[PDB]
Structures are given as C-alpha cells and as structure tokens.
Design an enzyme around this catalytic site. Structure first.
Site, PDB file in Angstrom:
ATOM      1  N   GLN A  19       0.826  -1.197   0.000  1.00  0.00           N
ATOM      2  CA  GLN A  19       0.000   0.000   0.000  1.00  0.00           C
ATOM      3  C   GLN A  19       0.875   1.267   0.000  1.00  0.00           C
ATOM      4  OE1 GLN A  19      -1.615  -1.149   4.080  1.00  0.00           O
ATOM      5  NE2 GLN A  19      -1.614   1.110   4.243  1.00  0.00           N
ATOM      6  N   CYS A  25      -5.104   0.470   3.454  1.00  0.00           N
ATOM      7  CA  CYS A  25      -5.325  -0.917   3.964  1.00  0.00           C
ATOM      8  C   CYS A  25      -6.708  -1.438   3.685  1.00  0.00           C
ATOM      9  CB  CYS A  25      -5.044  -1.046   5.471  1.00  0.00           C
ATOM     10  SG  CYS A  25      -6.054  -0.079   6.525  1.00  0.00           S
ATOM     11  N   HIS A 162      -6.644  -1.698  11.461  1.00  0.00           N
ATOM     12  CA  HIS A 162      -6.006  -2.085  10.223  1.00  0.00           C
ATOM     13  C   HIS A 162      -6.802  -3.179   9.547  1.00  0.00           C
ATOM     14  CE1 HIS A 162      -2.806  -2.769   7.510  1.00  0.00           C
ATOM     15  NE2 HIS A 162      -2.358  -3.881   8.046  1.00  0.00           N
ATOM     16  N   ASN A 182      -0.887  -9.451   4.691  1.00  0.00           N
ATOM     17  CA  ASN A 182      -0.757  -8.034   4.904  1.00  0.00           C
ATOM     18  C   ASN A 182      -0.430  -7.333   3.569  1.00  0.00           C
ATOM     19  OD1 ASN A 182      -0.861  -5.648   6.457  1.00  0.00           O
ATOM     20  ND2 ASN A 182       0.866  -6.251   7.741  1.00  0.00           N
TER      21      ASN A 182
HETATM   22  N1  LIG Z   1      -4.230   1.953   5.959  1.00  0.00           N
HETATM   23  C1  LIG Z   1      -4.973   2.961   6.786  1.00  0.00           C
HETATM   24  C2  LIG Z   1      -5.648   3.926   7.645  1.00  0.00           C
HETATM   25  N2  LIG Z   1      -6.649   3.246   8.489  1.00  0.00           N
HETATM   26  C3  LIG Z   1      -7.840   2.765   8.046  1.00  0.00           C
HETATM   27  O1  LIG Z   1      -8.194   2.832   6.879  1.00  0.00           O
HETATM   28  C4  LIG Z   1      -8.685   2.065   9.010  1.00  0.00           C
HETATM   29  C5  LIG Z   1      -8.718   0.542   8.819  1.00  0.00           C
HETATM   30  C6  LIG Z   1      -9.657  -0.065   9.660  1.00  0.00           C
HETATM   31  C7  LIG Z   1      -9.572   0.229  11.019  1.00  0.00           C
HETATM   32  C8  LIG Z   1     -10.524  -0.296  11.909  1.00  0.00           C
HETATM   33  C9  LIG Z   1     -11.528  -1.139  11.404  1.00  0.00           C
HETATM   34  C10 LIG Z   1     -11.604  -1.423  10.045  1.00  0.00           C
HETATM   35 CL1  LIG Z   1     -12.941  -2.449   9.467  1.00  0.00          CL
HETATM   36  C11 LIG Z   1     -10.662  -0.892   9.168  1.00  0.00           C
HETATM   37  O2  LIG Z   1     -12.556  -1.668  12.170  1.00  0.00           O
HETATM   38  C12 LIG Z   1     -12.936  -0.605  13.235  1.00  0.00           C
HETATM   39  C13 LIG Z   1     -13.554   0.534  12.419  1.00  0.00           C
HETATM   40  C14 LIG Z   1     -13.532   1.890  13.205  1.00  0.00           C
HETATM   41  C15 LIG Z   1     -13.987   2.920  12.171  1.00  0.00           C
HETATM   42  O3  LIG Z   1     -12.785   3.209  11.296  1.00  0.00           O
HETATM   43  C16 LIG Z   1     -12.991   3.940  10.197  1.00  0.00           C
HETATM   44  C17 LIG Z   1     -14.197   4.550   9.830  1.00  0.00           C
HETATM   45  C18 LIG Z   1     -14.278   5.332   8.651  1.00  0.00           C
HETATM   46  C19 LIG Z   1     -15.527   5.947   8.250  1.00  0.00           C
HETATM   47  F1  LIG Z   1     -16.514   5.399   8.878  1.00  0.00           F
HETATM   48  F2  LIG Z   1     -15.508   7.287   8.553  1.00  0.00           F
HETATM   49  F3  LIG Z   1     -15.802   5.749   6.926  1.00  0.00           F
HETATM   50  C20 LIG Z   1     -13.152   5.519   7.875  1.00  0.00           C
HETATM   51  C21 LIG Z   1     -11.938   4.900   8.279  1.00  0.00           C
HETATM   52  C22 LIG Z   1     -11.844   4.079   9.396  1.00  0.00           C
HETATM   53  C23 LIG Z   1     -10.625   3.495   9.761  1.00  0.00           C
HETATM   54  O4  LIG Z   1     -10.061   3.676  10.863  1.00  0.00           O
HETATM   55  N3  LIG Z   1     -10.019   2.653   8.751  1.00  0.00           N
HETATM   56  C24 LIG Z   1      -4.700   4.983   8.287  1.00  0.00           C
HETATM   57  C25 LIG Z   1      -5.865   5.458   7.387  1.00  0.00           C
END
Ligand SMILES: N#CC1(NC(=O)[C@@H]2Cc3ccc(c(Cl)c3)OCCCCOc3cc(C(F)(F)F)ccc3C(=O)N2)CC1
Length: 217
Positions: A19, A25, A162, A182
């Site tokens: 990535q 991710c 993640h 990963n």
């Molecule tokens: N690679 C990377 C990054 N992390 C992620 O994408 C994690 C990647 C991630 C993290 C946690 C996860 C999931 Cl399913 C994915 O399950 C718990 C989800 C908490 C909500 O997290 C997000 C919510 C949104 C929203 F609802 F606003 F659309 C957007 C993003 C997340 C989020 O935290 N996504 C640093 C941006």
C-alpha cells in the site's frame, strides 16, 4: 471445518502487495477478499484494482482511510458490482498522491452482488472461510509493527485499526493459527504474511469480518 485451510495453495490469493505511503489498507483488504471469492466461485485468478477504490469510492476517504463494508457498498451501488483489473488500473498511490477517479481505459476483472458481515465467532469465521474463500478482516495492528516471524500469541487486542486478508488456518499446530496476508510488501513478516494464534481472539480478529458475495441473488 477442516483441520487446515490455505487458500494460497489453491490459487485463490494473488501475490503480496504494497500500500506504500497511503492509508489504503481498507482497499487492499476489500480487493483481496474479492480476488479470493471470485476465484473460488470457479473463475481464473485475476489481480483487481485497489486504485479504483482509493480514487473512486466516494463513501471512503482514499488514502485518509476507509472501511471494507463501505467499499463493498460502493462497488455494488455505485459501480454496478464491477471491479477493475489491477493490470488496467494500476496502484499509483504508494507515494501518497491521489489521482482523480478515472473510469475509462480499464477492463472489468470481477463482479460482486452483495456482501455479508460474519458473526464475532472464530468457528463461524473458519467455516465460512473454508467454504467460500479469503475474508476481509480488521485487526489491532499494534503488535504487527515489530513482527519478524512466528505465531503471535500475546497480540495487543485493544482497538481495531487495520484491514487485512484472512487466507487460512492450521488447527494441527501447537498452537493453532490463522494465516493473514498483509499489504506492507513481502519484506514485512513471513514474506508478507503473519500467523496469529487461533481460538483466543488474537488482535481482535473476530470483531469485523466481512466478505463480498459472488453470483448471489
Ligand atoms: N491503511 C490505513 C488507515 N486506516 C484505516 O483505513 C482504518 C482501517 C480499519 C480500522 C478499523 C476497522 C476497520 Cl474495518 C478498518 O474496524 C474498526 C472501524 C472503526 C472505524 O474506522 C474507520 C471509519 C471510517 C468511516 F466510517 F468514517 F468511513 C473511515 C476509516 C476508518 C478506519 O479507521 N479505517 C490509516 C488510514
């Protein structure tokens, strides 16, 4: 379920990807699940496009992050179920730059009809995995940062952060483990993979498991 499952042996898992400097991710997890479900449904393995999600999915936030369930919803409700190929829509956001959505000039590699969310139960997840192919999951990745190999048995399990791809497991190991792909290149972990103990909800692996449906209603 079977004593062991490794979807990499069966041709349902593409090579490890990277990535880079982008919080995508969520898109790697989504795409890896679709690549898996599509192949297991009886189609030749095809690499699919993360860039499509990063650039075009208006629900999620590109390199600022996202959720696999949101990506599945976008694909179905905004893109007619279709997923572009990696070869025709390559990943260019590794440097963190985000080109605009390009809808032209691509080939469709796969199509999905819906998605499902699995219960928070390691045995339900194993069975679904064994029948249907690799699954999108979320983990607490705090313990991933310093991982150099082996089965993780005391993974920090406090907060999901993640998205990764669950590709198999082996119950005939001491201890039993899950196999996770990963998106940090094949220079991280066991050539891009990590093993974590199965049966103890390591890294909160059971909390947010989902999958696309291929060829559904
Ligand atoms: N690679 C990377 C990054 N992390 C992620 O994408 C994690 C990647 C991630 C993290 C946690 C996860 C999931 Cl399913 C994915 O399950 C718990 C989800 C908490 C909500 O997290 C997000 C919510 C949104 C929203 F609802 F606003 F659309 C957007 C993003 C997340 C989020 O935290 N996504 C640093 C941006």
């Amino acid at each position: 379920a079977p004593a062991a499952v490794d979807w990499r042996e069966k041709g349902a898992v593409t090579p490890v990807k990277d990535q880079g400097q982008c919080g995508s991710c969520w898109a790697f997890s989504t795409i890896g699940n679709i690549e898996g479900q599509w192949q297991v449904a009886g189609n030749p393995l095809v690499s699919l496009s993360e860039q499509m999600l990063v650039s075009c999915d208006t629900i999620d936030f590109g390199c600022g992050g996202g959720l696999m369930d949101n990506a599945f919803n976008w694909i179905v409700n905004s893109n007619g179920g279709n997923v572009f190929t990696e070869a025709s829509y390559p990943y260019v956001s590794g440097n963190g730059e985000q080109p605009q959505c390009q809808m032209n000039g691509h080939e469709i590699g796969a199509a999905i009809t819906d998605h499902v969310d699995l219960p928070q139960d390691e045995d339900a997840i194993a069975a679904y995995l064994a029948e249907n192919g690799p699954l999108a999951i979320a983990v607490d990745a705090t313990s991933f940062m310093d991982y150099n190999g082996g089965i993780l048995t005391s993974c920090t399990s406090e907060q999901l952060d993640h998205g990764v791809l669950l590709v198999g497991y082996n119950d005939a190991s001491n201890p039993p483990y899950w196999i996770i792909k990963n998106s940090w290149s094949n220079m991280w972990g066991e050539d891009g993979y990590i093993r974590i103990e199965k049966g103890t909800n390591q890294c909160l692996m059971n909390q947010a498991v989902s999958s696309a449906v291929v060829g559904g209603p």
